[PDB]
């Protein structure tokens, strides 16, 4: 009936700021200036496509 307390392991999964460098390049560098116009323009073009 002895239940030891779990040892919450230190994270080995890549942190949110580390995941951005796991791919070939640095994902933060390739970003647009105005994401607001990305979402609006892209959605319209998708329906036109």
């Amino acid at each position: 009936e002895q239940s030891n307390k779990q040892h919450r392991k230190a994270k080995e999964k890549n942190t949110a700021k580390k995941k951005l460098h796991t791919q070939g390049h640095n994902a933060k560098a390739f970003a647009v200036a105005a994401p607001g116009k990305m979402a609006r323009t892209m959605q319209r073009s998708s329906d036109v496509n």
Binding site: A16, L20, A27, V32, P35, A39, M42, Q43, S46
Partner: protein, 134 residues
């Protein structure tokens, strides 16, 4: 001390700290990198065109059952097979194989409904206000 600089000339450390930490947000990351549309059911579009492959529940005995209103549709954009709802079995008569159907977001697991068939509103056909052009 709260673990953050407070000096009157420490504006730069605060800005650079903020810009670095803003990328932690999944919403922020998706917005700037333009990845917010992977999770979208249609891959970013509000509607999807498809080809009616078969009417799965056509042989179900109980009328107007959930199964009777499901159709297996091929998304023309990517060729992935999906399942779509029809408002009622009466509308199912209009839908037959190998016509274009416009799908919109909605038996769990079926997340789409048919809004236009052959370029005509399904509601209009049900209300007897138009004819399906063939």
């Amino acid at each position: 001390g709260k673990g953050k600089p407070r000096g009157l000339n420490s504006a730069r450390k605060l800005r650079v700290h903020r810009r670095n930490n803003r990328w932690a947000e999944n919403n922020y990351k998706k917005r700037l990198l333009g990845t917010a549309f992977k999770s979208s059911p249609f891959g970013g579009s509000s509607h999807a065109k498809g080809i009616v492959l078969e009417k799965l529940g056509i042989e179900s005995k109980q009328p107007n059952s959930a199964i009777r209103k499901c159709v297996r549709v091929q998304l023309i954009k990517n060729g992935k097979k999906v399942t779509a709802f029809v408002p009622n079995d009466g509308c199912l008569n209009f839908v037959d194989e190998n016509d274009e159907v416009l799908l919109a977001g909605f038996i769990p697991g079926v997340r789409f409904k048919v809004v236009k068939v052959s370029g005509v509103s399904l509601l209009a056909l049900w209300k007897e206000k138009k004819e399906k052009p063939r």
